[PDB]
């Protein structure tokens with residue numbers, strides 16, 4: 037058991053192992069940057085906010101900890117450490133997560149500029165590779181967007197969720213009851229488009245403006261898609277629309293690598309059943325210089341029905357405690 041030191045930070049007492057040096061606030065929690073003497077890395081230490089105040093908080097704390105503990109991939113956030121000052125379950129009240137210090141997101145690095153095609157291959161390749169891994173764990177991100185992408189000055193990228201609707205799949209904005217993993221692929225298309233052009237693909241002013249802009253690019257639903265609409269009102273409203281043909285992408289993204297355009301076409305199909313998967317996209321000719329089928333790993337999946345239970349606060353609390361005590365730090 038490590039030696040802890042106390043320090044007032046972010047309006048509370050932080051209590052941390054001495055490996056974590058010179059805490060410096062930066063930000064479900066509050067965050068300090070710190071220097072980890074054990075590893076020599078700059079890190080984010082996140083003191084979780086009111087983790088066991090309510091059933092909802094406790095449940096969310098457990099889901100967060102468990103998810104993070106299982107994410108072990110270069111292009112996805114990982115847990116460097118999780119600790120509590122508590123010595124017993126009975127004194128267990130706080131949870132601190134430790135990750136790499138993530139000081140820049142995709143926006144901080146790209147800055148609204150057009151990127152070179154090679155540069156977009158590398159960034160998009162890395163998103164899809166993380167996403168293959170996430171999707172193999174039977175997880176849907178659901179809110180993938182530049183701000184949820186940590187990127188260092190070497191353009192090395194990690195998907196995370198820090199916890200704008202411009203990158204959201206159309207079905208997510210229409211509160212569709214059930215989603216497939218290709219909601220995230222939509223988001224990737226939106227991001228990819230923007231990296232190539234320097235402009236937000238669908239900058240809607242509100243909900244309806246967002247869909248309008250979408251349908252302008254990808255067309256109104258065709259007959260195949262209309263047949264899959266369960267809602268009689270949604271069905272009958274789509275039949276009220278004046279048909280739009282889907283724009284030819286080749287002429288929306290002029291001068292772009294023809295392969296970038298083709299991948300965009302396979303990503304940004306209105307029918308989510310027809311969108312390319314992450315694994316399929318990694319094998320696309322566009323990533324030829326990056327693709328290695330023997331280094332695009334998948335996750336072992338785990339039991340996410342345990343997260344969706346209806347339990348007592350003290351039940352969630354004790355389950356989160358076991359997850360803290362069982363943590364084994366990475367290589």
Ligand SMILES: CNC(=O)c1cc(Oc2ccc(NC(=O)Nc3ccc(Cl)c(C(F)(F)F)c3)cc2)ccn1
Pocket residue numbers: 062063067069079080082100103107112113133135136137138139170175176177195196197198
């Ligand atoms: C300079 N500032 C910082 O360095 C900094 C660091 C922070 O550390 C973080 C701590 C925890 C998380 N939690 C997730 O990311 N949870 C998550 C949920 C669902 C899904 Cl699907 C995923 C997945 F899989 F996509 F990764 C990840 C994110 C960031 C926070 C704020 N600031």
Ligand SMILES: CCCCCCCCO[C@@H]1O[C@H](CO)[C@@H](O)[C@H](O)[C@H]1O
Pocket residue numbers: 206207210212214215216247257261264274306307308309
């Ligand atoms: C008027 C705007 C229409 C938006 C239609 C979005 C179509 C989404 O695609 C749909 O995804 C569903 C949700 O996961 C699947 O169950 C359907 O089979 C699929 O067609």
